[PDB]
Amino acid sequence: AEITPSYALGKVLQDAAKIQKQQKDSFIAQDHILFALFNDSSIQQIFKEAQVDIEAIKQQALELRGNTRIDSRGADT
C-alpha cells in the first residue's frame, strides 16, 4: 500500500513551490501544496471537481490569513 512517491502525484514535491513564498513566506503549505493540486490533484470532469480556480485559492490563501505558514511549524493552514 502506497509504496510509491508517485511522481504523477509527486511532482508536487517540486510543483507545490508555486505559492509557498508568494504569501511572503518560506516553504510550501496545505492550501499551497493544494495550490499546485488544482493543476495536479483534482477531479476535472463534466462536473469538474477542481477547486478555487485561478486566484481564488491564492486569493483565499491570502484572503484567509495568508502568509499562512513559514516552515514546518504549526498545523498546516
Added chain:
Amino acid sequence: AEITPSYALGKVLQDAAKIQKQQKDSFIAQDHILFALFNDSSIQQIFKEAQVDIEAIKQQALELRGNTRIDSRGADT
C-alpha cells in the same frame, strides 16, 4: 520601432508576473522577468542555450535576495 512584444516573447513579461509567489514576492523583480525569459530568451535548438527554468535561479536567488526582495521600489541590484 519598439512597437510589439513578439508574442512569443510577449507572454514573457506577463510570464514574468508568474513567479512572484514562488520567488515569494509581492512584486516582480529583475530576476523574475528573466525568470520568464528562460524560454524565449534562449537559444533552444539543436545546440541549446536555453535559460535554466527553475533549478539554478531559485537557489541562486536564495543566493541573490530571497523573499528578502519583496519589491516596491524601482530596481536596484
